[model samples]
Target: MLWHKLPKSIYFRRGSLPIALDEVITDGHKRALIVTDRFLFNNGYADQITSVLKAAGVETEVFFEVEADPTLSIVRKGAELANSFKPDVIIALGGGSPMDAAKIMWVMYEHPETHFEELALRFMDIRKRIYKFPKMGVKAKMIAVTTTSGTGSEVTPFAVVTDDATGQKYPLADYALTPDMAIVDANLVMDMPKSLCAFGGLDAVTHAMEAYVSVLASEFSDGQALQALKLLKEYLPASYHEGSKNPVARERVHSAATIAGIAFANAFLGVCHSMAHKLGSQFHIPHGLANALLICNVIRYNANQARRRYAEIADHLGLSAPGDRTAAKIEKLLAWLETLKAELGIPKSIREAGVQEADFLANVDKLSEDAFDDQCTGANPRYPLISELKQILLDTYYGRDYVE
Candidate 1:
């Protein structure tokens, strides 16, 4: 048996933020807590949502403490505010950071007895895990309003939080973490800088690619993944170059990010994400860029086990000629990805991204162990040994050429 879960309501395209507001009003929610980063809050995006909620008679409190990679301390403080404010709705505004931060805050608010360390532990099977995630929405429903076209924290069952003490990132997954409503307003991302557009767009690309090749992939998820890839291929370049001036590009990429979210949410991700999570935490690389730098190498590494699946993606993207062997198709896919990264201004390796060789060498062992332990590795088509994971990290760091 299989299951597909999604937000209760999702609004896309321009001017969809108001639809989320309408839902809150229709539900008779009287109070809301807006969760966001200081950048969005200072730029008046938080106020935009607050004004709408307040005009509809909903009391509003803005929590703008969310950082790029939200720490456990900030989430704890946000939950503390939730306990006092007792809001009926929690609005997560900004990119993945704020949205992910809010999901944890919501979980803590609903189940105050939660032992976060236990809850965030890696599990091979979510359903058969020792610790069960409690049901949410008893106190307040969450509405994720995405200001960036990546992460898809607005729609996914995943929330990544960092433990500052250990420098470990816990990617918590549970259906209860899915938001009640998602607002993907292209208008919100119109003014996004080129750098963010590149990183966020590539992040969505990795989501589609990883989901398409995941061990648990099904036809239901394959459709979403393929469509997301197609749309991103068509629009991501323009979305990066034109920013908000090209409404069609921004809207398509925005929608693609959520579509990719649906794919990975159901199909699960692979070692690309598992390793990216570790690399990002260990070296302070941006999450999306970390994935971007590693995806091609990952695709090559999995080709022996998942060649047919990778070939299928190549065919879908028209990256290979008819009658090409699986290896040839895979090579074409790698070439296309390399070109895409260059186009998006993504660094070719961790070294190019500014990680010192000495630091990377020192941490490679721990990074590999943590990545192998990451829950996402369970769904990877290839089960990597610790040594193989280390090799992949070294290859990614040194820009080693793909052999197969």
Candidate 2:
């Protein structure tokens, strides 16, 4: 019964970048800060924005310091840059890394007194969380221009920042962190690598699946969640295999990423992401691949609590048959994910992803405890015990079927 929120404005399609960029300056903004990774900056993707902003007479500064997993110090540095730059508008110009880093940077820029311990606090209900996020958009507004098709960070109130000292990744949540505008231009993703496309597509699928069944799910969130899954189911494989050669497929997957972002932003996520957050960071695996490895087993474990919801997702994907029961439909959905993973070259197990079995086993206890404590875990339909979480980690690492 709570209100839903998204960016104030969203622009999509191939040629929408310039239109979106143009809108940023209509308010007479004179300075802009572009947050992104060095790869994009070195590859001249940053130039695209710099050129447009210069032509519009807006001053621009590039902060190309974001890493794959942005650290708290990195964002602090970015915030410092924003303080010095005094930009009126901040543009996030790459994938999730830049978008997430930019979001927290925007937070630090606006409220430098924000304590990470407070901002990163985990909660069951965001509205009822103890910490009140300071109102944003007072100092500078954010515009997320996504270059990758995954990491719906562009539209979501989530930003995962790693604390290097603790070696833990914190998925910070607050409506105040949501960007003011989102530019979901397909052209930005046309040149993405096939592997990146595959991982991103899978991440999008997980986002849709988890959001569809989240404890907070509503008709509004379900609408976006189901449509995103439908789009990814139809186009993700083609987009992964053909990349830029298939423009429509690529575009649809790109759009689905943001669509799923909106879905999960309102409905939140589940155990799949809770586990993936810890596993991916600990083992240095892709977040999407970690979710892919764990989602099937998660589906089985959650069947007892959310069978009807999972079955609805199966039905939406057309994986359900006339005489099939709900469990059977969920089975089909599991098989479909396995087949898709194989088709896209995802590793079958954490071991296959190059992590040593001994190393993984040694950390199972901490991983399970940390994962169980993850922010996303609170939204899961079924609450998992710590022992069960450990079992899930072991099973995922060994590629064993869920026996529960």
Candidate 3:
């Protein structure tokens, strides 16, 4: 259960929009770049953030082209933007895409000499390269403002970027990419659409559930994961469908996302993420949807060795019947998760998620191979051989029974 955490300072509060940038950014940062997407820019969320920074007398530049499933070329373009603006601070304002893109942008901005290939490798060797960003004298800091309550990209040490040419997604996990400051302002999340809220909430739930059962789960991470799981089960639906009218549920879901991020960042995740990473890039599945489709199967597969942990999660959610055996309790939990997905309108399988059968078969081998090499898979309670991993993908794709 021994574990380590790399500290990242976070400022969290309900309805705390237009965060105090003066306190978070040092005096040296006279100019700032705001990285965001077109929707936010058009919706006034982006304008609101820029107004705040302007009031602080910080010069600002806007890079408003970040799209869903960001690409390496986008990162390079963002870096070029940074170099042109020569900003002393980077402000990421939006959901996971903008936040993640900002992280990669900062990495490239700091090391103009380094390529994406080199930076991707550093994701695994974070400790050795911890000082490289600051040492390069870019003098640029990162501030993340989360407008969504899921992905926890604000506090996480990971960033996912896709390669446009090869259609592969690279998850860059390194302490160096962790934000220098994160603002979790609940007001910013009020406008999230119900569908995005549902999918994102499910992402947080899977993050907690997978990390709780992870072999890498630690004393610190286990508690956080369990707490997040409880919060998500209680509040996710309300927040997604009810909006800010249910203030209590909104607050809880918002808090749960960040807690889940901290938990998984420290404890790691399981095959759900591995599958999500592998299929998301190639098949055009949204990251959250990919996770939702595979989470139930991965849970059932892991329960073969982690019945007790699954049972514990079931008990915490009050889904377990009295006098239920551990296996029964685990099954009950998986069934509950399936019910939750249905209620949230999440697809039950990759096929249901809009992938053609031919496309799925064509990519099966590459998907399984990528899953086998994903960093998160190393923390799974039961490591699947490549053959077993391929079977998992097949079952997930066709919605077949996992129990052979």
Candidate 4:
């Protein structure tokens, strides 16, 4: 029996805020705690949401302490604030950082008994786990209001947090962490920088691509994944060039981000994300750029195990090659991604992304171990050996001498 899951509700399009907030949020709720960062908070996005909630008769408290790749201590502080505020609604505003931080904070806010290390376990099924996650929303329901078009943290059941002491990134996941609702309003993202647009678009592309061939993929996920891929391929470039000048393309890519999230959230992702999570938290690489820099290398690696699937992804995107073989098609697909990554100004290798060769070699062992033990790795179509993972990392860092 296959299981499929989605958030309770999602609202997308241009200009769906304010009034929609009334629809998704309960007016009876007395207070709302908004989880966001200094940028969004200072730029009036948080105020925009706060004003809407206030008009709906909900008092609000804003936690602007969330930073990118939020650490455990950061989440604990936010949850502590949430506990005192006693909000019935949490509005996670901004990119994956604040949205992800909000969901992690909600777990501890609702359940003080939550064990951070245990909750980040790698391969346990939540439905059958000995340490069951408590039910959420006893204190608050979450509303994800996305300001950027990536990570889909607004609707996904996953959240990543870095350890303050160790810098080990833990991607915690459970159905209880899924938000109650999500809003993808393109108008809010119109002013996004060109670089952010590129990075966010690539993040969605990785989500769709990884889910399309994931071991856990089902018919439901395939449909969503395909749709997201089609949209990302068409609009991401246009959105990058036009920026706020083309509102229609911006809205389409924004919708595509959520669609990709819906796909990967259920189908699960693969090693691309496992490595991206650890590498980002480790080297301070931005998550989306990390995925971009490493994705072509990953696709080449996975083609051995998911050959036909990679070929299908190429065919769906209208890529053609010199031969009908899966290898031929996958090479064309890699070429397409390489071109896209270049067009977006993403680095071709980890060295270009600012990783020193000495440090990379020094930490390869621990990185491989962390990636193998990551929850996302279990769903990889090709389960990588430690040696293979290290080779992949080495290839990603330097120029190719890739493992065959």
Candidate 5:
């Protein structure tokens, strides 16, 4: 076994929320900026967080403008808020969007001298320049509280922020940006609606599946990805069906998301995320659903390059037929994914997702181009050229299978 370590620190359990805040304050954080969306804020989540901090005697300011598929401008606005507040800790509360927004906002907050354009450069080493800003002190510590069981944004070292003007999503991947602490309180996830839970579970499933097959996988990542896949396969549906009643299932699925996130952060993802990052913001499709639509297709596309990896995943899921050839085993995995999605009430096609055919057709070319340039595409196991990507997008929108 090769040596490797998953970098982020995690605290898990139900009703363990308040302790996380206390720990941050104990580390000398006097003030914190809570980043979340308006929905979470209005739904009393913001108040719940504020109450915890107040009881712990830590000052906090809330920024509730985090939109789904966060944008560069919005993160800059968040940085401005942090600058004015001068928070010693940046608390990311809610799901992936807020957490991702907080990561970018921390980057901008600590390095005000760096332009948005400069920060967007892939793999730029900014560690030396961080916290050099006169107004801002050293980099504020980051804490992520995951209220959802998908996206693994809480522990991952990457943030997906969109450029609204171009309708393109950028993957800001760097070890420096990983949250200092991630609180995995399952109680915070108890209120997720069934539909959201189902979609988020599928997102976790795809993350594990994609990372298991990624070209970047090491022994460590493969182990984490396999365990995450097993947990999702066994417990995701139970969590979705029983909701708060299935606390065991909820914890398993939640932990699976973070583990799969750590796996993908090291091993990276494939075209499903590439397409998801692109078409999601453009068509206003939910990120998880967009990933769900293309996941099976991308799996089939990648199987040609890494048949043994796909076969191992199929065998683990018990989808492989006796005496099954590689092609047959691959087909079984794809079929099982469709059945899994159907069981979760997920739509099989983008059109079925309530995106009008006229609107989809109107933007097909733009969508294909966007996917071609997505940062995630570079790491995909099967690299598709623009022409091939166009075909894939059309097939995905029309619910067709991969061709060659």
Candidate 6:
């Protein structure tokens, strides 16, 4: 049997906020704590959400300490505020970090007896785990509002939190952690800078491709993932170049990001994400950029195992040709991915992405172990050994994504 989980409701459109919020949110009466980063708070965007809630008679508090990679401390602090404020709802605003930070904090606030170490432990089913998350919404519900078009954290059942003490990132996943609702407003994402547009939209594309090739993929998920890929391919470059000026581009990428999330949230992801999660937090690379940088590299490695699947996606992207062998079609797909990365201005190598070569070499062993241990690895089409994983990282670092 298979199951697909999604938020209770999702809103997507040009002006799909402020008005749609009331219907999506329920019982946000006493207090609605917004788990967000300071950038959006300082820019008055947070106030936009706050105003809507205030008009609906919901009091608001802001825990605006979420940072890049969202360390455990931030989640703990946010939970502490939740404990006191006793919010009826949490509005997660910003990109992946804030939304992920909020999910962990929600788990913490609901069950203060649980420790960060235990809550972050990998679990196949949330209820069966030793660190079982108590039924959520007894305390507060979560509503994610994304300002970036990547991550899809607004809808997914995953969160990556860094343990500052260990300098390691733990990708926490459980169906229970999925948001109660999500707002996929392109208007919220329209004004994002070009750099964020490139990183976020490319990350969305990676999600679609990875899910389409995932061992656990099903026809239901394939539809979403493939359509997401098609939409992103058409719009992401335009969105990056035009920003808010191209409303159609921004809206399509924004909508596709959530669709990709819905697909992967059920179908699961692969080594690309496992590697990205480790590489990003370990070297302080942005998560979206890390995924963007590693996608084509991982695709090449995964093609042999997922040849038919890759070929299918290639066909959808117009890379397939008549009489093309799987190998030839795979090459066509890889070439297109490389060209996409180049067009998006992503550096071709980990080194070009600013990871010092010596640091990468020194950490390759630990990086491989971390990636192998990452939860996403289980869904990869082919299980990779430590040696192979290390080689992929080294190859990525040396510009193999561009070279071979």
Predictions in order: lDDT:
0.89, 0.88, 0.82, 0.85, 0.81, 0.84
RMSD of each: 1.7, 1.7, 2.4, 2.1, 3.3, 2.1
Least well predicted 10-residue stretch by lDDT in candidate 4: 122-131
Residue-by-residue lDDT tens digits, candidate 2, 1-404: 56589999889988888888888778788999999999999998889888988999999999998998889989999999999999889999998889988988998899888677776764223667555678889888899999988889888888878887887667777788889999988988888887888888889999999998889899889999999999998999999888889999999999999999999999999999989988877887888888888888888888874899988888999999999998799899888989998998998888888888889988999999988988789889999999998988888888897777
For candidate 1, write residues 212-239 as lDDT tens digits: 9898899899999999988988899998
Candidate 4 lDDT, 215-272, residue by residue in tens: 8888889988988988988999889988888899999999999999999988888898
lDDT of 6 at 385: 90
| Model 1 residue pairs with clashes | none
Error at 64, model 4, angstroms: 0.7
Pairs of colliding residues, candidate 2: none
Q: How big is the positional error of residue 109 in model 5, measured in Å on the Cα after superposition?
A: 1.6
lDDT (Cα, tens digit) per residue for candidate 6, span 77-101: 9999999998888889999889999
TM-score of 4: 0.94
- Predict model 4's lDDT versus the native: 0.85
Candidate closest to the true structure, highest lDDT: 1
Pairs of colliding residues, candidate 3: none
Arrange candidates by lDDT, descending: 1, 2, 4, 6, 3, 5
Q: Give me the displacement of residue 336 in model 5, in angstroms.
A: 1.7
How many clashes show up per model? 0, 0, 0, 0, 0, 0
lDDT of 5 at 30: 81
Candidate 2 lands at a TM-score of 0.96
Clash count (model 2, backbone only): 0
Stretches of candidate 5 off by over 4 Å are 1-7, 122-137, 163-170
